[PDB]
Design a binder for this molecule. Structure first.
Ligand SMILES: OC[C@@H]1O[C@H](O)[C@@H](O)[C@H](O)[C@@H]1O
Ligand SMILES: OC[C@H]1O[C@H](O)[C@H](O)[C@@H](O)[C@@H]1O
Length: 400
């Protein structure tokens, strides 16, 4: 598999990966996160952990378990860290700590390297043996709720190091190494692989979307952070000027996200009257269906209020789609304003750029080529893999 990436990134990146992998042959590595079920962290680890194994690394991946209440508490911590807002009962921290204890009993932690992904398992460091512990933060912690952050920083300060997706998430109030490594797409995964036009046509038609007219696509959960209501608004404002245009909102549920409906109803409401709005809800691991819709799209949106990175952006740029992205978090390192897409602070701004891109075919096409090249140079899985191997070599040598 790893030799297949030379086509994209060249022989020098691949040789470096082998050289780093050689130095790490005798370390065991554990990844712990909140879901294998699909999207985001699971989607990365489903490609990344097997690549680590192909390079001869003893890499394992274990998923924590919880009650509906546990995921209620962790979803509230997530929103509180990203928005700086929310009322957090004292009971939330007790539920959290109790489910750390339960998982610690059921997950062996005797590894040379332990990667803990995101806040849900951060408390497992209480039960650490003598290996190197790395907190992999996927979310925006730039301006967090002081009580939720104060609590979490209690655990984070005990790690050997920490990975954030962009430098802007690095914390002034931590002394441990903070390394900025963005997530990545696998260009050979079912999400990103080339499809024949037949496959694209099949899937777009199946869902009752007109292939012969322009499609505006957002791939995202029905989550307030992705602002589905604001996407509909953007589309409604643009639709006056581009009457042939259709909106497809392609959502899926998340194992650690119980707050996934009512927003759907609000979205349905904001959609009422417009027949060219398609609010789709697909199973997780509908990767080829997402692929098809991204290739079918004329313009892609990721109009997030908050976003750690937004893999949906690089997925669209790779397929040569311009992206209108929320001016926030890791969207800003993928969407280079006027080059790979446009950054927006409101639905009204999004509408202006929707009409611009739909009226300017050569500009759209150029932006798409610049998007793919920007992802080829920055956001492919071999770069993330190479930088992870370097972080492990760096931090294990500091630990020992
Ligand atoms: O640790 C939280 C995780 O964050 C990712 O961005 C997201 O794709 C997953 O659905 C999950 O919520
Ligand atoms: O890092 C992978 C994903 O993790 C989570 C974040 O909310 C999302 O922004 C990111 O793309």
């Amino acid at each position: 598999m790893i030799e297949r990436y030379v086509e994209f990134v060249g022989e020098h990146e691949i040789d470096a990966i082998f050289k780093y992998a050689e130095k790490l042959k005798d370390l065991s590595i554990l990844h712990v996160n909140s879901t294998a079920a699909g999207g985001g962290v699971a989607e990365i680890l489903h490609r990344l952990v097997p690549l680590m194994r192909e390079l001869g690394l003893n890499a394992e991946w274990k998923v924590i378990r919880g009650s509906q209440d546990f995921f209620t508490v962790t979803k509230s911590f997530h929103n509180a860290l990203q928005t700086g807002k929310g009322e957090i009962p004292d009971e939330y921290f007790k539920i959290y700590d109790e489910w750390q204890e339960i998982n610690a009993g059921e997950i062996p932690l005797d590894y040379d390297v332990v990667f803990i992904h995101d806040p849900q398992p951060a408390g497992l460091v209480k039960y650490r043996k003598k290996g190197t512990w790395i907190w992999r933060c996927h979310i925006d912690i730039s301006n967090p709720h002081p009580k939720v952050w104060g609590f979490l920083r209690g655990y984070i300060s005990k790690y050997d190091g920490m990975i954030v997706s962009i430098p802007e998430f690095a914390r002034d109030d931590l002394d441990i190494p903070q390394i900025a490594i963005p997530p990545s797409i696998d260009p050979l995964s079912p999400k990103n692989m080339p499809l024949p036009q037949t496959t694209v046509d099949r899937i777009v038609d199946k869902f009752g979307v007109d292939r012969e007219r322009p499609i505006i696509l957002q791939v995202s959960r029905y989550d307030r952070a992705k602002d589905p209501v604001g996407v509909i608004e953007s589309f409604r404002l643009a639709k006056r000027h581009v009457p042939d245009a259709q909106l497809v909102y392609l959502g899926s549920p998340a194992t650690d996200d119980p707050e996934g409906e009512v927003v759907y109803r609000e979205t349905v409401e904001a959609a009422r009257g417009e027949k060219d709005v398609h609010l789709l809800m697909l199973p997780p691991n509908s990767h080829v269906e997402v692929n098809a819709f991204q290739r079918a799209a004329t313009v892609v949106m990721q109009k997030s209020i908050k976003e750690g990175f937004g893999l949906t952006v690089s997925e669209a740029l790779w397929k040569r789609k311009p992206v209108i992205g929320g001016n926030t978090g890791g969207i800003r390192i993928q969407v280079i304003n006027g080059v790979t897409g446009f950054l927006v602070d409101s639905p009204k701004a999004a509408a202006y750029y929707l009409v611009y891109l739909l009226k300017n075919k050569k500009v759209r096409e150029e932006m798409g080529e610049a998007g793919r090249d920007h992802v080829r140079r920055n956001f492919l899985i071999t770069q993330q893999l190479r930088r992870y191997l370097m972080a492990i070599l760096y931090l294990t040598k500091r630990h020992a």
